[PDB]
């Protein structure tokens, strides 16, 4: 098994990283349970409320009468909404009050006092024409008969008992308004008395509270012409007839004493002998006197003082409308205003306009509501404002008067309003918005797992360790499938444990959790392969965490701005904005929440069917999410093939079409080195041999071991060791050998002893359970070279296997390699030549892309070496030494004449003659008198051969230095067109977007708009239903109503044909005509909300309400349905939820289709005889007419009028729909206009004249403008927050330049080597304001670019310009110290943006101290007075309130000057501008704090004495340093040199103390760090020149010294900006050498020693001696061997702070050494007898190396084991013992240094 064990290993790895971090795993599983245990608690504190079916009673308008109007004003003040239909919704019946006391009184009075007994009463009274008396047996007889017959008829015994009972009561707590409210309807000195009386009952004051404007307030009418007075006399005729209740008290008081004075004299004389002569009724006549006049006077004593509280006058003229507004606002604060009629226009058209208050008329900027509420919108206070405010009670007083004036012919048709019935429903505000708050709460709940998958995928690539698996045989199918199946772990487990929360905490009940899980487990396979695609762009694992969450939440906001404008969203633009995955979950979630409002959720059998018409099902959403996963991790398997990163080869425009060599021969037993050049030759050959790309780039084409193109054969034979430590962090040491063992062939049982063998051979068997985070940095590299040898490899390619390693571990690595070579082949390729000399074999070098030479280093020394050299160890005279050297062989030379030593150049042919022992036996006899203590031998070093064979194939002088900083910062600005100008464009873009976003919201206070009342809703349905057609008059009004609706006049063709039913469906017919119904019968029922099946509106079958009624269509688009003789409160209930169904998709601006309609019909069917009472009063008008109209006969006129005008009244119910806000008055207006064009004589279609009304509320006041304005003044707060955020943004781009430039070169070379901090640390500020000034102005002009804030004038922006100029002068010092305190590289950018956002949100909540409430003791004023002073220490926030208050003052002055008189502008005044200038004009103090950080240098010659280090280092002499570091060695030199602090003891810093003498401490010490001291982005020598010319130049030494640095550095021939590997530390050290032209001081420096090729290091280690040769100090740090051999002296090594050694390297090689090295080449069939010969001549001479004929021998000094004999006998006796060619040297002191490595 190959794939299915690579997958098990690659999936066990991800499980082991996911197990060792159990706060990653626990937090990412309890975080989506702190987001969905908030929704469970917001659900259980807003439960659904379910309401029954409301049927409402009717509200008659004053056209109906004055007793029905007052009954429907006082009684049904509440809109009770009965569940059974009221008696005023059924056809014919009109008034639902025929059991109250008033209506029974009028009924009995009309049926008795107009009855048939009054007929014979008037017949008896007609006999009195005789001359008897002017006020006889037979007229007395007839009158007695008739009156006695009528006596029992007035014993009506059913209402008058109740009236006498109600009037004669004790007082009680019955208020003077609650007294009438038992009689009307059953289930100002005179006003102020009852006003005090009414307070005892809250219902009484709640009825008076809005009855008060109608009976106190006044009414005003504007243009005051003859026409207007002629009209408003008719409106005053309504309040005139209410003062006929009062003059009957006048008639009663002039009649009452006349009756009462007929007592005790007339009762005996004047009536007793006239009445009592003749049973029951003569006994009733005398039993009547006591309670007759007293009770009717007690009745009229109350009735008549109600007229005394009504004003006599309510009308009052005006000159014009502009005086009406002023007089109105005068009267309104007097508490006496009803309304103001304003007539209008310049013929017959009338243009009435009612201007009311604004707490009293409904507001007029909308015709509907934004968010559909499923109520009936019938609440008596908050949305019937036309009814209790009194708009519609005044409308059809005025309309009826205009109808009566424009036409003549007093119409009579009373109007009754009637709201429509409404079905059973539920109100559930949580689930109406769940399509908007479920996507948000799961985009945030899975944003922590998306950042963990992007972090893991990118760190498997940043650490160069996806490369070391794909170069180990692994696929790219496997690597990506192991990330898919393992990042779908927690995603698919936290989407199976929040389905329980949804179904079980009732967020989505009635659903079935299978269908919800399988829709949340296709969103989770489309967000895994999105966090892969987001990680195909990045290469850093810490930027990726902070951009994965941001680009996962930035893909959701296209759903937020797509649910808002959902109405105008075409369905193609919704199946193509579902190609972002957090949006296709939006449109599936809005369709899973439309199936909850229909009772049954997402079950298995509706998961293919769309709920409403233009929505998705759930199967189309899951299909879109899988398509949207497929083509979305299909980009990754393309995008990483054409942009792999920056290590790796691209492969553009894919289709799926699909040891040896020419040059070398590596052998089967050697340890071949490969040291050529890090150029075009070396890294390509190991790449081709390691097979990562096919070969075409020059070098060679012979396939190496088996076959280059059959790589899977030799992939289990060779192992590579890369540069990087191939090592997983959180896997322990044993599991690495296990993992790379099982991945590379070997079965699961043969891998067993392999762990034992490796962990024994590397030296790690104790710590075989430590994670490899917890390993020292040279123990990892010695493990990571041991897992190249696993599985028995043979052709092991190593690749620099010692870089950056502590030298003890570097010898451990060499021991490991030297034992692992006997049966293998090693091709290690290093730079440092000590390895290739020491552990070398046949050494091959390449140069220029081709092979240069190869062979053993002895062979290369034979045919390329110069020859032997002799050095002398100890001015006597040079030519005597020349003669002594040229005594034997005259071809020699003495190359360097030094006073300390000499070095010769001898020919190696000179020793080939056997002339060695002659030389040194004479020198053994001559060194006694040459004044020299000894000699030593040397060969040509291997680096000489290497370089030589490479040669074949290859007061004003301080202010001109601002410019030195300025051009480096200027070129930083100029060259960074790829990572910058996000510091300029971003704030202008954000301030433009913020000002554009301040356009959607209209301002407040602009209620009063003209609003033509007629029907304005557009296309609509509106019915009608004629009740009784018997009379010709109301057959005209019907036609006029239709011609109002838009119906044409009926032509002579199809004359009885305008209406026609649609097609009834047949199933409807066979379900209707089988339950035996007629249009007055109930229809089939509809199903309400069962216990456990709640739903908004009921589920109605198709035959609910009946067949469709005979409709017709107009031309304006108004369906008009004939609905005559059907049950009209059964049709309107059962067809409501199917008219409004397209508005149940979005629930915003819902066009309900049917808004109202009419219902005609004559008077109430019931009690007859409207003309009998008039006949009775007309007959009883005889004999009683004293005053013809003198306040007595007017009673008789109005009583005859009240009788005669009773039977001929029409009706109109007006059904309205209150969710349209203006339907009440639209249809009252159409009714009045249609009554007008019916009494026109020529034809009802009269096109001359027409009533219109408007609705224009009255001018607002100061607390009415300002309160609504400050409530609306919140989008400008968002504008201000965006302004302060975007303008605080770009200094966080400024400080990035200082983040990686803290201390690294400028602070510790440019400011310390010559001590100039004074310019630099304020010149950063100067350059920041210099390059802030233009991104200030370029943000200033975005105000002007969009006409949304700027508005050109001196009053706005004379100082906001200066405000936006001083922001960056202020903000610059207070946010530098993220750089030079708590150094973090490019990671606290999130922190800096967050803290500026925290400043902005403190400024945001600063001014919002008030929302609705306030307290008593000036606490808000004290809090805003404290925030006035709170701007003192916070320069980022004080402005953030001044911009707010300045915008408010701007708009305040604009309003108060464009509405009222002229006030002073305050553009510069103290409360906004001068105090802010005084606050902000001190950032130099913060600049001094920032520079005082540098004056403390931080956030707030060598004598060592037991710090047993007995070290004396004198200045002026070079000193060496080797050994180990990191144990307290470099730190010890740091606390010597001042980087670190020591706690106890004493410290010497050049004889100067720190806290005692600051001047001597600053001036006398300069110490370069070891932290790769460079600013990486430069352009080369010219930075170095200009930092040199920061000191002492008359603008002319720049050229001289730049020419010197160009001439003396030959490494400047390359590009004007070099690459970075070519430049760097070598030019930096040459720059320091150039900087010491003015430095005669100690230059003890860390010398970082960047590991470059030795070609430039020849010039470096020559010129560092050649420049500093004056006798001053030279300091360098050695870590490899050749730089120790280049320039060293007496060297110090710390061994736990103890010295066990001391000496210069000549002293070290004299005392501590081990003699000489014999290098020898013999054939292997002769080598061990040659070793026997060596042991014969040298019994006991030590041998170190013996392999392949390569023999090395260690020769101790003393006797024959020393020099002077050995090469002589090897020339004599060793010549015939198989030796062909060999050389000797003194011991190269790596192995002498092995004792120094064994010291520790
Ligand atoms: C950086 C950009 C960020 C992008 C984010 C913006 C997009 C989405 C953000 C938030 C989601 C919601 C968006 C903000 C509000 C959404 C709309 C809103 O809620 O307005 C006020 C609502 C009134 O609306 P309705 O629900 O009555 O709607 C009428 C009708 N059904 C319809 O379909 O329209 O009254 C109420 O809130 C009910 C109060 C009493 C019961 C409350 C109970 C229910 C209320 C809330 C439920 C939990 C939501 C909590 C939200 C807090 C986080 C903001
Ligand atoms: C109002 C509600 C706001 C909700 C915001 C949710 C954010 C996280 C919520 C709670 C965190 C819980 C508190 C933190 C827990 C403390 C522990 C902690 O710091 O974790 C850091 C983790 C560590 O994982 P690693 O990356 O090191 O490796 C994990 C790897 N995959 C593996 O398992 O092998 O990496 C990270 O996540 C670093 C990023 C930090 C996470 C935030 C990353 C978010 C970054 C940017 C997006 C923020 C919000 C989006 C911007 C506007 C939204 C308003």
UniProtKB/Swiss-Prot annotation:
Cellular component GO terms, alphabetical: cell junction; cell surface; early endosome membrane; endoplasmic reticulum; glial cell projection; Golgi apparatus; Golgi membrane; intracellular membrane-bounded organelle
One Pfam family named in its UniProt record: ABC2_membrane_3
Regulation of its activity: ATPase activity is decreased by cholesterol and ceramide. ATPase activity is stimulated by phosphatidylserine, phosphatidylcholine and sphingomyelin, but phosphatidylserine is more effective.
Enzyme Commission designation: 7.6.2.1
Reported tissue expression: Expressed in leukocytes (at protein level). Widely expressed. Highly expressed in myelo-lymphatic tissues including peripheral leukocytes, thymus, spleen and bone marrow. Expressed in the hippocampus and the cerebellum. Isoform 2: Abundant in lymph node, spleen, thymus and trachea. Isoform 1: Strongly expressed in brain and bone marrow.
Class of the enzyme per the UniProt entry, highest EC level: translocase
Coiled coil: none
Keyword Isomerase belongs to the record: no
ABC transporter domain sequence ranges: 659-873, 1502-1721
Extracellular-side positions: 43-437, 1005-1278
UniProt keywords, alphabetically: Alzheimer disease, Amyloidosis, ATP-binding, Cell membrane, Cell projection, Cytoplasm, Disulfide bond, Endoplasmic reticulum, Endosome, Glycoprotein, Golgi apparatus, Lipid transport, Membrane, Neurodegeneration, Nucleotide-binding, Phagocytosis, Repeat, Translocase, Transmembrane, Transmembrane helix, Transport
Its job: Catalyzes the translocation of specific phospholipids from the cytoplasmic to the extracellular/lumenal leaflet of membrane coupled to the hydrolysis of ATP. Transports preferentially phosphatidylserine over phosphatidylcholine. Plays a role in lipid homeostasis and macrophage-mediated phagocytosis. Binds APOA1 and may function in apolipoprotein-mediated phospholipid efflux from cells. May also mediate cholesterol efflux. May regulate cellular ceramide homeostasis during keratinocyte differentiation.
Residues reported in the UniProt entry to bind ATP 2: 1523-1530
InterPro entries in the cross-refs: AAA+_ATPase, ABC2_TM, ABC_transporter-like_ATP-bd, ABC_transporter-like_CS, ABCA, P-loop_NTPase, R2_ABCA1-4-like
Residues carrying covalently attached carbohydrate according to the record: 236
Disorder cited: Alzheimer disease 9: A familial, late-onset form of Alzheimer disease. Alzheimer disease is a neurodegenerative disorder characterized by progressive dementia, loss of cognitive abilities, and deposition of fibrillar amyloid proteins as intraneuronal neurofibrillary tangles, extracellular amyloid plaques and vascular amyloid deposits. The major constituents of these plaques are neurotoxic amyloid-beta protein 40 and amyloid-beta protein 42, that are produced by the proteolysis of the transmembrane APP protein.
Protein name: Phospholipid-transporting ATPase ABCA7
Catalytic activity, as annotated: ATP + H2O + phospholipidSide 1 = ADP + phosphate + phospholipidSide 2; a 1,2-diacyl-sn-glycero-3-phosphocholine(out) + ATP + H2O = a 1,2-diacyl-sn-glycero-3-phosphocholine(in) + ADP + phosphate + H(+); a 1,2-diacyl-sn-glycero-3-phospho-L-serine(out) + ATP + H2O = a 1,2-diacyl-sn-glycero-3-phospho-L-serine(in) + ADP + phosphate + H(+)
Protein family (similarity comment): Belongs to the ABC transporter superfamily. ABCA family.
Compartments (UniProt record): Cell membrane; Golgi apparatus membrane; Early endosome membrane; Cytoplasm
A single BP term in Gene Ontology: positive regulation of amyloid-beta clearance
Database matches in PROSITE patterns: ABC_TRANSPORTER_1, ABC_TRANSPORTER_2
């Amino acid at each position: 098994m190959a794939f299915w064990t690579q997958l098990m290993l690659l999936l066990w790895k991800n499980f082991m990283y996911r197990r060792r971090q159990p706060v990653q795993l626990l937090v990412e599983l309890l975080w989506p349970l702190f987001l969905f245990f908030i929704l469970v608690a917001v659900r259980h504190s807003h439960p659904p409320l379910e309401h029954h079916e409301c049927h409402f009673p009717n509200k008659p308008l004053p056209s109906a009468g004055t007793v029905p109007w007052l009954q429907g004003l006082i009684c049904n003040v509440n809109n009770t909404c009965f569940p059974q239909l009221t008696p005023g919704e059924e056809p014919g019946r009109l008034s639902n009050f025929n059991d109250s006391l008033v209506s029974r009184l009028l009924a009995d009075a009309r049926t008795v006092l107009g009855g048939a007994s009054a007929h014979r009463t008037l017949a008896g009274l007609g006999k009195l024409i005789a001359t008897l008396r002017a006020a006889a047996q037979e007229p007395l007889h007839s009158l007695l008969e008739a009156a006695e017959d009528l006596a029992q008829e007035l014993l009506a015994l059913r209402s008058l008992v109740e009236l006498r009972a109600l009037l004669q009561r004790p007082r009680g707590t019955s208020g003077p308004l609650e007294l009438l409210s038992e009689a009307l309807c059953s289930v100002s000195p005179a006003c102020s008395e009852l006003i005090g009386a009414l307070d005892s009952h809250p219902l009484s004051r709640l009825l008076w509270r809005r009855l008060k404007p109608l009976i106190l307030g006044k009414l005003l009418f504007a243009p005051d012409t003859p026409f207007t007075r002629k009209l408003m006399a008719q409106v005053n005729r309504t309040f005139e007839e209410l003062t006929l209740l009062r003059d009957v008290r006048e008639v009663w008081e002039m009649l009452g004493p006349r009756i009462f004075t007929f007592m005790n004299d007339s009762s005996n004389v004047a009536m007793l002998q006239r009445l009592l002569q003749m049973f029951l009724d003569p006994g009733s006549g005398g039993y009547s006197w006591q309670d007759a006049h007293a009770d009717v006077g007690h009745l009229v004593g109350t009735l008549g003082r109600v007229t005394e509280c009504l004003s006599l006058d309510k009308l009052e003229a005006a000159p014009s409308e502009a005086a009406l507004v002023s007089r109105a606002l005068q009267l309104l604060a007097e508490h006496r205003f009803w309304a103001g009629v304003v007539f209008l226009g310049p013929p017959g058209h009338v243009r009435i306009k009612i201007r009311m208050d604004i707490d009293v008329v409904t507001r007029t900027n909308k015709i509907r509501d934004r968010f559909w509420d499923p109520g009936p919108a019938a609440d008596p206070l908050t949305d019937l404002r036309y009814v209790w405010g009194g708009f519609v009670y005044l409308q059809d007083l005025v309309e009826r008067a205009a109808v009566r004036v424009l036409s003549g012919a007093n119409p009579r048709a009373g109007l009754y309003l009637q709201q429509m019935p409404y079905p059973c429903y539920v109100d559930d505000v949580f689930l109406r918005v769940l399509s908007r708050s479920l996507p948000l709460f799961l985009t945030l709940a899975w944003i922590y797992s998306v950042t963990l998958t992007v972090k893991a995928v990118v760190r498997e690539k940043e650490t160069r360790l996806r490369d070391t698996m794909r170069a180990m045989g692994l696929s790219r199918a496997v690597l990506w499938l192991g990330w898919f199946l393992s990042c779908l772990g927690p995603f698919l487990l936290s989407a199976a444990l929040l389905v329980l929360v949804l179904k079980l905490g009732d967020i989505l009940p009635y659903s079935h959790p299978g269908v919800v899980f399988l829709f949340l487990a296709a969103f989770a396979v489309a967000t895994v392969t999105q966090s892969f695609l987001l990680s195909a762009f990045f290469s850093r694992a810490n930027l990726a965490a902070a951009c994965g969450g941001l680009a996962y939440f930035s893909l959701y906001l296209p759903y937020v701005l797509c649910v808002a404008w959902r109405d105008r969203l075409p369905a193609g633009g919704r199946v193509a904005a579902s190609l972002l995955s957090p949006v296709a979950f939006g449109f599936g979630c809005e369709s899973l929440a439309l199936l909850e409002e229909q009772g049954e959720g997402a079950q298995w059998h509706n998961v293919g069917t769309r709920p409403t018409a233009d929505v998705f099902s759930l199967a189309q959403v899951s299909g879109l999410l899988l398509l949207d996963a497929a083509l979305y991790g299909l980009a990754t398997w393309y995008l990483e093939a054409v942009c792999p990163g920056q290590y790796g080869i691209p492969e553009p425009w894919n289709f799926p079409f699909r040891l040896r060599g020419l040059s070398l021969d590596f052998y089967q037993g050697h340890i071949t080195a490969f040291l050529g050049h890090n150029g075009a030759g070396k890294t390509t050959t190991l790449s081709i041999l390691s097979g990562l790309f096919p070969p075409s780039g020059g070098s060679a084409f012979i396939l190496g071991h088996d076959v280059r193109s059959s790589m899977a054969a030799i992939r289990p034979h060779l192992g590579v060791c890369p540069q990087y430590n191939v090592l997983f962090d959180m896997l322990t040491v044993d599991e690495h050998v296990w993992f790379y063992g099982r991945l590379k062939g070997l079965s699961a049982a043969v891998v067993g002893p392999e762990q034992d063998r490796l962990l024994q051979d590397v030296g790690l068997v104790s710590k075989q359970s430590v994670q490899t985070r917890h390993l020292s940095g040279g123990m990892q590299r010695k493990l990571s070279v041991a897992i190249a040898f696993v599985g028995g490899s043979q052709v092991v390619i190593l690749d620099e296997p010692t870089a950056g390693v502590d030298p003890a571990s570097r010898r451990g690595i060499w021991e490991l390699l030297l034992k692992y070579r006997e049966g293998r082949t090693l091709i290690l390729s290093t730079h440092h030549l000590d390895e290739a000399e020491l552990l070398g074999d046949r050494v091959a070098v390449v140069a220029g892309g081709r092979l240069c030479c190869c062979g053993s280093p002895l062979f290369l020394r034979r045919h390329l070496g110069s020859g032997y050299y002799l050095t002398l160890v100890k001015r006597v005279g040079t030519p005597q030494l020349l003669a002594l050297v040229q005594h034997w062989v005259p071809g020699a030379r003495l190359v360097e004449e030094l006073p300390h030593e000499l070095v010769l150049v001898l020919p190696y042919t000179g020793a080939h003659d056997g002339s060695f022992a002659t030389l040194f036996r004479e020198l053994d006899t001559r060194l006694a008198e040459l004044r020299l203590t000894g000699y030593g031998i040397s060969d040509t070093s291997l680096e000489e051969i290497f370089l030589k064979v490479v040669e074949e194939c290859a007061w004003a002088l301080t202010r001109q230095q601002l410019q030195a900083l300025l051009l480096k910062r200027f070129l930083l600005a100029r060259r960074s067109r790829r990572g910058l100008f996000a510091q300029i464009v971003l704030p202008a873009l954000f301030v433009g977007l913020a000002l554009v976003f301040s356009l959607i919201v209209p301002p407040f206070g602009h209620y009063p708009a003209l609003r033509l009342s007629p029907t304005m809703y557009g296309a609509q349905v509106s019915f009608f239903s004629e009740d009784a057609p018997g009379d010709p008059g109301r057959a005209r009004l019907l036609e006029a109503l239709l011609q109002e609706a838009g119906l044409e006049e009926p032509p002579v063709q199809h004359s009885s044909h305008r209406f026609s039913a649609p097609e009834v469906p047949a199933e409807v017919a066979k379900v209707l005509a089988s339950g035996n119904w007629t249009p007055e019968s109930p229809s089939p029922a509809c199903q309400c909300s069962r216990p456990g099946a709640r739903r908004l509106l009921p589920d109605c079958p198709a035959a609910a309400g009946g067949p469709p009624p005979p409709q017709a269509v107009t031309g304006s688009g108004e369906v008009v349905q004939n609905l005559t003789g059907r049950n009209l409160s059964d049709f309107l209930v059962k067809t409501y939820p199917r008219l409004v169904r397209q508005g149940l998709k979005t629930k915003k601006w819902v066009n309900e289709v049917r808004y109202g309609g009419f219902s005609l019909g004559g008077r109430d069917p019931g009690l007859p005889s409207g003309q009998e009472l008039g006949r009775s009063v007309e007959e009883l008008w005889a004999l009683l007419s004293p005053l013809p109209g003198g306040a007595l006969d007017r009673v008789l006129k109005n009583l005859t009028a009240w009788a005669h005008s009773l039977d001929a009244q029409d009706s109109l119910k007006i059904w309205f729909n209150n969710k349209g806000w203006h339907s009440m008055v639209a249809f009252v207006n159409r009714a009045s206009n249609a009554i007008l064009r019916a009494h026109l004589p020529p034809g009802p279609a009269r096109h001359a004249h027409s009533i219109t009304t408007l609705n224009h509320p009255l001018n607002l006041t100061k607390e009415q403008l300002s309160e609504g304005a400050l409530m609306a003044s919140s989008v400008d707060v968002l504008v201000s927050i965006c302004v302060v955020f975007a303008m605080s943004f770009v200094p966080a781009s400024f400080t990035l330049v200082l983040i990686e430039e803290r201390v690294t070169r400028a602070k510790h070379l440019q400011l310390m080597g010559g001590l100039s901090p004074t310019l630099y640390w304020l010149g950063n500020f100067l350059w920041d304001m210099c390059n802030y000034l233009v991104p200030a102005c370029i943000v200033v002009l975005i105000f002007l670019a969009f006409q949304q804030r700027a508005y050109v004038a001196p009053a706005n922006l004379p100082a906001l310009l200066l405000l936006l100029l001083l922001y960056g002068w202020s903000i610059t010092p207070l946010m530098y110290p993220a750089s030079f305190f708590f150094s973090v590289p490019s990671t606290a950018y999130v922190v800096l943006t967050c803290i500026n956002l925290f400043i902005g949100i403190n400024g945001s909540m600063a001014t919002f101290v008030l929302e609705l409430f306030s307290d008593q003791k000036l606490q808000e004023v004290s809090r805003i007075l404290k925030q006035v002073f709170l701007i003192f220490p916070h320069f980022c926030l004080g402005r953030g309130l001044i911009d707010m208050v300045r915008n408010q003052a701007m708009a305040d002055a604009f309003e108060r000057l464009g509405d009222r008189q002229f006030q002073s502008p305050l553009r510069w005044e103290v409360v906004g501008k001068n105090l802010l200038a005084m606050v902000i004009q001190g950032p130099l103090f913060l600049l001094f704090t920032l520079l005082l950080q540098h004056r403390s240098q931080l956030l707030p010659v060598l004598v060592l004495r037991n710090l047993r280090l007995c070290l004396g280092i004198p200045p002026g002499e070079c000193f060496g340093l080797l050994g180990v570091n990191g144990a307290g060695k470099t730190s010890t030199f740091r606390m010597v040199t001042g980087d670190t602090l020591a706690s106890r003891g004493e410290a010497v810093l050049a004889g100067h103390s720190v806290a005692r003498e600051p001047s001597a401490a600053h001036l006398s010490m300069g110490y370069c760090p070891q932290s790769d001291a460079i600013f990486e982005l430069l352009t080369g020598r010219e930075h170095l020149e200009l930092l040199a010319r920061l000191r002492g130049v008359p603008e002319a030494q720049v050229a001289q010294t730049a020419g010197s640095g160009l001439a003396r550095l030959g490494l400047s021939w390359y590009a004007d900006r070099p690459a970075g590997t070519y430049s760097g530390g070598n030019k930096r050290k040459l720059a320091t050498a150039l900087a010491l032209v003015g430095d005669p001081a100690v230059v003890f420096l860390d010398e970082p020693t960047t590991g470059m090729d030795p070609s430039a290091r020849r010039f470096l280690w020559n010129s560092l001696l050649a420049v500093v040769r004056e006798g001053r100090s030279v300091m360098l740090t050695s870590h490899s061997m050749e730089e120790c051999e280049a320039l060293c002296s007496r060297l110090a090594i710390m061994v736990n702070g103890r010295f066990r050694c001391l000496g210069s390297p000549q002293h070290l090689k004299g005392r501590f050494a081990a003699g000489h090295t014999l290098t020898l080449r013999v054939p292997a069939a002769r080598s061990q007898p040659a070793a026997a010969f060596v042991a014969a001549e040298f019994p006991g001479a030590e041998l170190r190396e013996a392999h392949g004929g390569r023999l090395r021998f260690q020769l101790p000094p003393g006797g024959r084991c020393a020099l002077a004999r050995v090469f002589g006998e090897l020339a004599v006796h060793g010549a015939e013992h198989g030796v062909e060619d060999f050389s000797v040297s003194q011991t190269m002191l790596e192995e002498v240094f092995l004792y120094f490595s064994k010291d520790q």
